[PDB]
Amino acid sequence: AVQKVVVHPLVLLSVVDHFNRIGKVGNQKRVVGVLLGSWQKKVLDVSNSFAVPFDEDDKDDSVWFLDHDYLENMYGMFKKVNARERIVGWYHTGPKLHKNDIAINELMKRYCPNSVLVIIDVKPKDLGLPTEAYISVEEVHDDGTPTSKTFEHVTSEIGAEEAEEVGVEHLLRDIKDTTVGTLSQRITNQVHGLKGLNSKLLDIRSYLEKVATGKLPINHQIIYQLQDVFNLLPDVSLQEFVKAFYLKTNDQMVVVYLASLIRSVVALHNLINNKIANRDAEKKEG
Amino acid sequence: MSEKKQPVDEDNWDDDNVEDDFSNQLRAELEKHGYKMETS
Amino acid sequence: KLVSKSVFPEQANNNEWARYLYYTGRIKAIQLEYSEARRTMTNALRKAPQHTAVGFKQTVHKLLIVVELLLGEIPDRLQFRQPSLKRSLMPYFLLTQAVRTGNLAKFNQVLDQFGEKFQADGTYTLIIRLRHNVIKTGVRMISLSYSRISLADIAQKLQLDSPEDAEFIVAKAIRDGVIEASINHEKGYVQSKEMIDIYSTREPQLAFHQRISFCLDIHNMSVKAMRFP
């Protein structure tokens, strides 16, 4: 395999309304329903999906039920009314996974050989995009365990469609179009500096988890390696960027030229009609 | 205030100081000093 | 004034604010604050264009440009020649000619010859560093011309009688930051040189906060000007 996904918010509301279907009744654990999908390339798409009744008792996390007859009858309806659509996986509303999810996944990989799950949150405040993709494949193990069948975080994104926001941006009414030039950059400053480096501080919290704990899979495979991709910049004290300040002066050069010349011409913009219309409105007032 | 007696009774203003040296001196400047190479 | 300086909230009639900045800039003439005086006396010069055809703008320019001659360098003054000025010989055409020449005999012939009109100057502190402005105009012209110059050339070509007197003038020139000269005090070498990095790497992009601070000031003066009707 999967490149990434294309997921419209329509199917997310198709999770939300069934969360309304279960929020009125006894919610045991969470929602598990079908994720239909439009798989064409190694990229993915989802235009629609549906749900299915489900309970689970947490004693061996193996007593859990869908209705495959209901799944294939309503899938026969939706396949009948739309030949484009097919199943691509499932979803769950509780944002943390558990051990049964490989039995859900591998139990429904019999219909199509991939069955991607979707993490969402019905009350999201801290995540970025809600949508999430795994794939249940193996890297065996370095020790080669008996089939360490593993979910893999395939990258994920919100999909888009022409004329799908006809509802949406009319509904929300709150959008300030083109806040370039005012405070959007510092919204992204607070949220990327703070909300980026706090994630860095939870990764260094996981480093302390390797200090006092974390011997499970101490993970000396990807961590220092892509952290050496990070360590393309060893930015230690004395800072060692003598070969970057004439670079910085080259970067500052043209832009401060544009501010000098161009903003002098911005003065040349305001002054003419400001004076002429000024004294028109001044000495032509009486 | 202003009068009290007086109602009864890139240009040259840029150049006139060097043009003074173009007014009294060095008329045939490198044409006698230009002639120093062969007259002397 | 200096303990209780209070100037206008808003400027008055431009004749009054013009002549007012001429008065206080004419105080900074004798106070010898040469930086502010050239721009407030330039401002005051250009800001009063209306005058009687026999003068008072040549009075304002005449008694304006004396310390501008005393800056060590001057441009060739204004830009609009006046013949009744030429009859009155007010701001000394011949003396500023003696300034841009490195001359001393005709210079002090202007000084000694016209002293009844130097009474009409009333600012005899002009000459006491204006002969010094002749010699600094000479060393500034020659030093500005040559890449390297030596005391064997200038110290007796300008007849300063000795190496060390020119080393004192270049001591005051490096003290004034005029020249990037050096002097080997062993054989008598002014081992003078010219510094480098005239490119627009850093200095104009630093200057653009003065250029654009100026521009935003005129933006806001245009806005406050718009606030009136």
UniProtKB/Swiss-Prot annotation, chain A:
GO terms for molecular function: protein homodimerization activity. Keywords: Acetylation, Isopeptide bond, Proteasome, Ubl conjugation. Residues 5-140 form the MPN domain. The keyword Ubl conjugation applies. GO terms for cellular component: cytosol; extracellular exosome; extracellular region; ficolin-1-rich granule lumen; membrane; nucleoplasm; nucleus; proteasome complex. GO terms for biological process: proteasome-mediated ubiquitin-dependent protein catabolic process. There is a cross-link at residue 176 (Glycyl lysine isopeptide (Lys-Gly) (interchain with G-Cter in ubiquitin)). PROSITE patterns: MPN. The keyword Ubl conjugation applies. The modification N6-acetyllysine is found at residues 200, 210. SMART domains: JAB_MPN. It comes from the Eukaryota. Gene3D superfamilies: Cytidine Deaminase, domain 2. Component of the 26S proteasome, a multiprotein complex involved in the ATP-dependent degradation of ubiquitinated proteins. This complex plays a key role in the maintenance of protein homeostasis by removing misfolded or damaged proteins, which could impair cellular functions, and by removing proteins whose functions are no longer required. Therefore, the proteasome participates in numerous cellular processes, including cell cycle progression, apoptosis, or DNA damage repair. Component of the 19S proteasome regulatory particle complex. The 26S proteasome consists of a 20S core particle (CP) and two 19S regulatory subunits (RP). The regulatory particle is made of a lid composed of 9 subunits including PSMD7, a base containing 6 ATPases and few additional components. Within the complex, PSMD7 interacts with subunit PSMD4 through their respective MPN domain. Interacts with TRIM5. Belongs to the peptidase M67A family. Does not bind a metal ion. This is 26S proteasome non-ATPase regulatory subunit 7.
Swiss-Prot record, chain B:
The keyword Nucleus applies. GO terms for biological process: double-strand break repair via homologous recombination; mRNA export from nucleus; proteasome assembly; proteasome-mediated ubiquitin-dependent protein catabolic process. PANTHER family: 26 PROTEASOME COMPLEX SUBUNIT DSS1 (PTHR16771), 26S PROTEASOME COMPLEX SUBUNIT SEM1 (PTHR16771:SF0). The lineage of its organism: Eukaryota, Metazoa, Chordata, Craniata, Vertebrata. InterPro entries: DSS1_SEM1 (IPR007834). It is found in: Nucleus. Component of the 19S proteasome regulatory particle complex. The 26S proteasome consists of a 20S core particle (CP) and two 19S regulatory subunits (RP). The regulatory particle is made of a lid composed of 9 subunits including SEM1, a base containing 6 ATPases and few additional components. Belongs to the TREX-2 complex (transcription and export complex 2), composed of at least ENY2, GANP, PCID2, SEM1, and either centrin CETN2 or CETN3. Component of the homologous recombination repair (HR) complex composed of ERCC5/XPG, BRCA2, PALB2, DSS1 and RAD51. Interacts with the C-terminal of BRCA2. Keywords: Nucleus, Proteasome. This is 26S proteasome complex subunit SEM1. GO terms for cellular component: cytosol; integrator complex; nucleoplasm; proteasome complex; proteasome regulatory particle, lid subcomplex; protein-containing complex. Its main location: nucleus.
Curated annotation (Swiss-Prot), chain C:
GO terms for molecular function: enzyme regulator activity. Keywords: Isopeptide bond, Phosphoprotein, Proteasome, Ubl conjugation. It comes from the Eukaryota. The modification Phosphoserine is found at residues 150, 162. One of its GO terms (cellular component) is proteasome accessory complex. Component of the 26S proteasome, a multiprotein complex involved in the ATP-dependent degradation of ubiquitinated proteins. This complex plays a key role in the maintenance of protein homeostasis by removing misfolded or damaged proteins, which could impair cellular functions, and by removing proteins whose functions are no longer required. Therefore, the proteasome participates in numerous cellular processes, including cell cycle progression, apoptosis, or DNA damage repair. This is 26S proteasome non-ATPase regulatory subunit 3. Residues 18-197 form the PCI domain. Component of the 19S proteasome regulatory particle complex. The 26S proteasome consists of a 20S core particle (CP) and two 19S regulatory subunits (RP). The regulatory particle is made of a lid composed of 9 subunits including PSMD3, a base containing 6 ATPases and few additional components. Interacts with UBQLN1 (via ubiquitin-like domain). Interacts with ERCC6. Signal peptide: none annotated.
